[PDB]
Amino acid sequence: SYDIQAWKKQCEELLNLIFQCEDSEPFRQPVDLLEYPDYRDIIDTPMDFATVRETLEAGNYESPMELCKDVRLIFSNSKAYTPSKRSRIYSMSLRLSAFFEEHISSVLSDYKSALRFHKRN
Numbered sequence: 001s002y003d004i005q006a007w008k009k010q011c012e013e014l015l016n017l018i019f020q021c022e023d024s025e026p027f028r029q030p031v032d033l034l035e036y037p038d039y040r041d042i043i044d045t046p047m048d049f050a051t052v053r054e055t056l057e058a059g060n061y062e063s064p065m066e067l068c069k070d071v072r073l074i075f076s077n078s079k080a081y082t083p084s085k086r087s088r089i090y091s092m093s094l095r096l097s098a099f100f101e102e103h104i105s106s107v108l109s110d111y112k113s114a115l116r117f118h119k120r121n
């Protein structure tokens with residue numbers, strides 16, 4: 001399975017699954033600062049799933065590693081803002097992160113394999 005391009009639709013389908021998860025709702029849109037006016041003192045680089053889907057559809061990711069870095073930022077940014085490791089939203093982020101890591105592993109493996117095969121000779 002050496003298709004160098006296959007990651008892109010694979011990542012589109014996984015983002016569709018994440019948007020279907022109730023656990024995604026808080027992380028779907030860029031954080032609103034009216035409810036959280038201190039956010040940009042705590043979080044240097046805001047990220048959300050709509051930004052990730054738009055970046056993908058724009059043709060502005062070169063690899064599934066770059067998309068994975070952005071998605072992991074959504075979860076590190078969630079971990080950075082939680083006052084309690086027993087926060088509802090933080091707990092939502094931990095479950096969605098486990099779901100995401102479970103599904104992205106084959107995408108990364110298949111892509112890195114395809115690129116090694118491309119440079120075999």
Ligand SMILES: CC1=Nc2ccc(C(=O)N3CCN(C(=O)NC(C)(C)C)CC3)cc2C1(C)C
Pocket residue numbers: 026027031036038077078079081082083087089090
């Ligand atoms: C994505 C996210 N992930 C999490 C995780 C936890 C919370 C959360 O429950 N809190 C309480 C309220 N906070 C506040 O800013 N208040 C202070 C007292 C610090 C001033 C801190 C975050 C909010 C979010 C969002 C931004 C939606």
